[PDB]
Amino acid sequence: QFEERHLKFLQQLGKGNFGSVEMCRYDPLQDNTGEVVAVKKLQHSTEEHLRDFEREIEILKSLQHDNIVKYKGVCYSNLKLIMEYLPYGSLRDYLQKHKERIDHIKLLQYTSQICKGMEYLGTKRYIHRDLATRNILVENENRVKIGDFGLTKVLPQDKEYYKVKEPGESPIFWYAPESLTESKFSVASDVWSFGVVLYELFTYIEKSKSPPAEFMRMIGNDKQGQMIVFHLIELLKNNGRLPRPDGCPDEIYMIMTECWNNNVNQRPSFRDLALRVDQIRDNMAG
Numbered sequence: 001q002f003e004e005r006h007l008k009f010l011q012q013l014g015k016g017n018f019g020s021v022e023m024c025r026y027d028p029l030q031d032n033t034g035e036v037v038a039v040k041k042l043q044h045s046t047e048e049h050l051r052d053f054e055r056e057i058e059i060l061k062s063l064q065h066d067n068i069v070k071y072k073g074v075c076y077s078n079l080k081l082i083m084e085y086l087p088y089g090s091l092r093d094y095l096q097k098h099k100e101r102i103d104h105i106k107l108l109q110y111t112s113q114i115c116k117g118m119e120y121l122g123t124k125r126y127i128h129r130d131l132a133t134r135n136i137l138v139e140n141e142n143r144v145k146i147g148d149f150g151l152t153k154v155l156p157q158d159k160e161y162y163k164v165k166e167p168g169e170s171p172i173f174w175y176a177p178e179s180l181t182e183s184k185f186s187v188a189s190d191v192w193s194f195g196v197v198l199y200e201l202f203t204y205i206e207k208s209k210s211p212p213a214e215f216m217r218m219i220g221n222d223k224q225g226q227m228i229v230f231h232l233i234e235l236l237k238n239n240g241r242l243p244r245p246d247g248c249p250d251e252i253y254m255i256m257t258e259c260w261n262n263n264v265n266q267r268p269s270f271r272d273l274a275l276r277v278d279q280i281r282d283n284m285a286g
């Protein structure tokens, strides 16, 4: 395990939901030779949030994949999750900085990795719910990882969806329609959100091109709080979709639109998305 007293704070990496992640150095020999690790804690530690956190810890402990952030351990006194530190930060920030250096062939490499990591989760009947470029992390130039499992749920034995209505701010512009209407989350709603991730990447995180900004423009910025979700629901029901990003080939946009099917069952699987992305990659290399 990890001793609280040997964990030296370096910086805050992110703050969100009811938790934070910190860059720390675990230096149990106090000779400044310990490794830098990522440390996740709760901001305001409730009982329901701590039980979620414990499950989250067991979720990640159970996962071992090249494209999923490595579990290192836990720290007791208030529970803390110790993970590997990924030095290049979020795919969101990284893409925005190196937008002139990252070509479509690279975006597809990242996309394929995201798919493989996502398929590995579905293999364990884990539903991620929260997939976005902000929580996909960059280990190095040739490798990304799914970096946070804060909202990840296990499916019940007898069902292919999981129903959950959480209070507060929900990332609604990444959600499938049936998640907005019925609070149903599944592998197929993760596929929807993966479509939004694909979109993000191909916008190169241009600010005015983000899903919130695009959907808000399509709805009309004169909308307030609770009416937003309602109008979004209607737009999706009427086959309103995010536009093709500048420079996106039509066959990559086709992947996106196929992920965004209103019919939960007609969305592609993560194994087929990977095959299709890999095939497009292979053709761009020739």
Ligand SMILES: Cc1cnc(Nc2ccc(N3CCN(C)CC3)cc2)nc1Nc1cccc(S(=O)(=O)NC(C)(C)C)c1
Binding pocket: 012, 013, 014, 015, 016, 017, 019, 020, 021, 038, 069, 083, 084, 085, 086, 087, 088, 089, 090, 093, 134, 135, 136, 137, 147, 148, 150
């Ligand atoms: C598990 C994990 C391991 N290493 C790193 N490293 C990391 C993260 C961000 C940066 N950044 C962000 C801050 N910016 C100023 C510099 C680069 C650099 C390294 N980050 C990790 N995760 C993580 C970091 C920040 C935010 C998030 S998160 O997915 O947004 N989760 C919370 C914050 C809502 C709980 C996740």
